[PDB]
Structure 1
Amino acid sequence: VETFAFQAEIAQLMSLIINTFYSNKEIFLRELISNSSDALDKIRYESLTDPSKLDSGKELHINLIPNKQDRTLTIVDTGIGMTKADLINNLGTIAKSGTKAFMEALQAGADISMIGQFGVGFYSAYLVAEKVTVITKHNDDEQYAWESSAGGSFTVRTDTGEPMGRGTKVILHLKEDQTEYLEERRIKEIVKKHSQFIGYPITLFVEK
C-alpha cells in the first residue's frame, strides 16, 4: 500500500467540503453519475477507432448499489476507468485550476452546488462519506484501489478483489447521519431530479 499527500489546494477543497455548513448534500450523486457518464462517453468514442477497447466489456451502464449492512452506497460504471497515473497525479493536477476558480467563486457568492461547473465534483463525495474507496480498471493498466478519509492523504494499492473488466466503482462509506442515501425512495428522487437526461441505463439495485 502506497500513501500520498494531496496537493495543498485539493486538501483545502476537501476540508471546505467537510467543514462548511451546507444542507443540500444530495448533489454529490449527480456529480458522480455525471463523471460516470463522461467516462462512458470516453470509452464509446475511443471504441469507434479501436473496437478492441470494448474486449473488456461491451455493456455501457451505471449501477447504484446501496448496502445498509456495510453502510455504503456504490456508484459503478463500465466507462474508461482510471490508470495508476490518473489516481496518483493526473486527475488531481487537472483539478487544481478548477479548485482555485471554485474557491474564488465561493468567497464571491457561488455555492457548493456549482462545484461540477468547475470540474471537481468528485470531491463532493465528502459531503456524505467519511471514507471513499475507488476501485478502477483501465484497459492500459491493472486494477487499483484508491482510498481516502481525507485529512490530507490518500492510498493506492493494486486490488486483489474480484476483477471488474473495465470501469470504476466509487464506494461511499457514509457518515452516521447520512444513511438517507441508502433508501430506495431517496435515491430515486435524487436521480429523477438531477440526472434525468443521462444517456446510459442507470439501474438502482434493491436491498436483500
Structure 2
Amino acid sequence: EVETFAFQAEIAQLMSLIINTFYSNKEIFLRELISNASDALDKIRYESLTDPSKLDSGKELKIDIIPNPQERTLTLVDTGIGMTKADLINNLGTIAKSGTKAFMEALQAGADISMIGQFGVGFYSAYLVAEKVVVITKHNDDEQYAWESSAGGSFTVRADHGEPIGRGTKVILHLKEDQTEYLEERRVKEVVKKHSQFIGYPITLYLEKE
C-alpha cells in the first residue's frame, strides 16, 4: 500500500533548483544530514530526562555512515527521535514552506547553496548527490515508515514491514552515476573531518567490503 503525494509547488521548485543548478561543492549534503541526525538525537536525549521510558526502544545514541559500492548507496542511520506519519506527509512540509521561500530569496541576491541549512531545508541537499532518497524512520508513538522520492514533484509514504530499526532514522542515498566518490570511506572520512568533527555523538564510518 503505497500512497503517493505531491510536494508543495515551492518545494518541488527548490528540488529542481538543487538538481538543475551547476554547483560543484556538493559534499555539504553530508554535513546537513549528520546535523539533522544530531538534532534528532538531542531531542530524544532531552525528552528522556523526564520520561526515561522513551529509551526502551534503544539506549544507544549514535550515527552510522555506511557506504555500499555495489548497491550504489550511502546510508546515514541515527537512533534519534525519528519521524511520525504526520511529519512525513504534512508537518515537515508546513515548516519547510517558509524556509524554502527565504532561501530562494537569498539565492537570488547572491547567497550560495552551501547556506541551505540556515533555512531548515538542509535535507534536500541530499539531491545534490542522490537520484533517489529513501527514508526509513520510527518514532515511539507510531509505526515504522518508508518515505521515498526521486523528485519529479512527488513522494510516497507506506508502512514499512522490513527489519525494525527500533527507533530513529535511516536515510538511504541512491547516488548519481557521477557521485560515487562518496561510496568510499576514505572520501567520507575526509568530509566528516572538515565539517562534522565535533558532533557530540559517536559517528562510525563503515568500510566498503569491496
C-alpha contact (below 8 Å) 2:63/2:201 kept by paired residues: yes
C-alpha separation between the residues in 2 aligned to 1:160 and 1:54? 21
- Once the two structures are superposed, residues 121-180 of structure 1 have per-residue CA deviations (whole angstroms, 9 ceiling, x without a partner) of 000000000000000000000000000000000000000110010000000000001000
TM-score by length of 1: 0.99
Q: Does structure 1 retain, via aligned residues, the 8 Å contact 2:184–2:208?
A: no
Alignment partner, residue 104 of structure 2: 103
CA RMSD of aligned residues (A): 0.4
- Name the CA distance, whole Å, in 2 between partners of 1:72 and 1:206: 13
% identical aligned pairs: 93
Q: TM-score if structure 2 supplies the norm length?
A: 0.98
**1:187 deviation in Å?**
0.3
Paired with 1:86 and 1:168, the residues of 2 have a C-alpha distance of: 13
Residues 133 and 173, structure 2, Cα contact 8 Å, conserved in 1: yes
How far did residue 69 of structure 1 move?
A: 1.0
Q: Quick check: 2:27–2:191 contact (8 Å CA) kept in 1?
A: yes
Provide the residue aligned with 2:24 in structure 1: 23
Q: Distance in 1 between matches of 2:48 and 2:122?
A: 26
Tell me the equivalent position of 2:121. Answer: 120
Listed as ranges, the gaps of 5+ residues in structure 1 are none
> Displacement, 1:22?
0.1
| 1:58 corresponds to | 59
Distance 2:58 2:185 in 1: 28
The equivalent of 1:73 in structure 2 is 74
Work out the CA distance in 2 between the residues paired with 1:76 and 1:192. 18
CA distance in 2 between counterparts of 1:90 and 1:9 reads 15
Shift of residue 184, structure 1, vs aligned partner = 1.3
| Structure 2 Cα separation of the partners of residues 41 and 25 of structure 1 | 26
Residue 207 of structure 1, CA deviation: 1.6
Structure 1's consecutive aligned runs of 4 or more residues displaced over 6 angstroms after TM superposition are none
Q: Secondary structure at the match of 1:35?
A: helix
